Swiss-Prot record, chain C:
Belongs to the fungal fatty acid synthetase subunit beta family. This is Fatty acid synthase subunit beta. Fatty acid synthetase catalyzes the formation of long-chain fatty acids from acetyl-CoA, malonyl-CoA and NADPH. The beta subunit contains domains for: [acyl-carrier-protein] acetyltransferase and malonyltransferase, S-acyl fatty acid synthase thioesterase, enoyl-[acyl-carrier-protein] reductase, and 3-hydroxypalmitoyl-[acyl-carrier-protein] dehydratase. Residues 1-85 form the MaoC-like domain. It comes from Candida albicans (Yeast). The chain holds residues 1529 to 1613 of 2037 of the full protein. [Alpha(6)beta(6)] hexamers of two multifunctional subunits (alpha and beta).
Length: 85, 84, 85
């Protein structure tokens, strides 16, 4: 069996649909064209705007990352992260 | 009379690279227009003042030297519903 | 830093600034100015977007007045370093 994460799930359903060398290209083109629409419309719906330089310089000095719309929390349970959100 | 539409703002901010989130359209906030969109509203009123006969010059040697903006004290910035 | 555009045609059609000095090879060469130089109103809006985020902490309501002198000319794709005091 096979599966994909956040993005690569389209390559897992590419993987079971492709058979030969000609069939694999026809299903790969439907995959890379698909994630041009996931690519463009997720930026056209939520356009990233400029960030205040107080914020990102604080984030680099606190040991965090440059701010972006997804944030990874390690070392905490799911029941206590949702206590913080 | 120009009406500040939502499309005229986003084409303008993309042309000037203004990233600032107050100018892109988000729910829960009235979409604000650039203050440099003043010159888009008021170009055809400004450069009509160099066409009269009493100011007679070689227009092809015109040099734009300086421009300035000034919000009137107590005036709100431009919105996307404003008839201007 | 900021950087000039590649061509002056996007800003001209938006702002209505259809001066053929900025877009045409032959009008810019007629007045003996060094090429299809950038709009002044681009360098108005570009530097004002710098001071709106780097001096006003990306708050768009704070900047209430902005004036500049177009002391020099800039060719496209030139890299502009500004100071802010």
């Amino acid at each position: 069996w096979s599966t994909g994460h956040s993005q690569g799930l389209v390559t897992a359903v590419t993987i079971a649909a492709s058979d030969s060398w000609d069939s694999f290209l026809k299903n790969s083109l439907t995959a890379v064209s698909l994630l041009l629409f996931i690519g463009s419309r997720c930026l056209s719906t939520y356009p990233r705007t400029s960030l205040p330089p107080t914020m990102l310089q604080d984030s680099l000095d606190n040991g965090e990352g440059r701010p972006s719309p997804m944030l990874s929390v390690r070392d905490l349970s799911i029941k206590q992260v949702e206590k913080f959100i | 009379e120009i009406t500040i539409s939502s499309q005229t703002i986003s084409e303008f901010t993309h042309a000037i690279g203004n990233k600032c989130d107050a100018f892109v359209d988000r729910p829960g906030k009235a979409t604000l227009a650039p203050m440099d969109f003043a010159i888009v509203i008021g170009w055809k009123a400004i450069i009509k003042a160099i066409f009269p006969k009493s100011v007679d010059g070689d227009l092809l040697k015109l040099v734009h030297l300086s421009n300035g903006y000034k919000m009137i004290t107590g005036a709100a910035p431009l919105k996307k519903g404003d008839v201007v | 830093t900021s950087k000039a555009p590649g061509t002056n045609e996007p800003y001209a059609i938006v702002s209505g600034d259809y001066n053929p000095i900025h877009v045409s090879r032959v009008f810019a060469a007629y007045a003996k100015l060094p090429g299809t130089i950038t709009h002044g109103m681009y360098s108005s809006a570009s530097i004002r977007a710098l001071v709106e985020e780097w001096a006003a902490n990306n708050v768009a309501a704070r900047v209430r007045a902005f004036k500049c002198d177009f002391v020099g000319m800039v060719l496209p794709n030139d890299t502009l370093q500004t100071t802010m005091e």
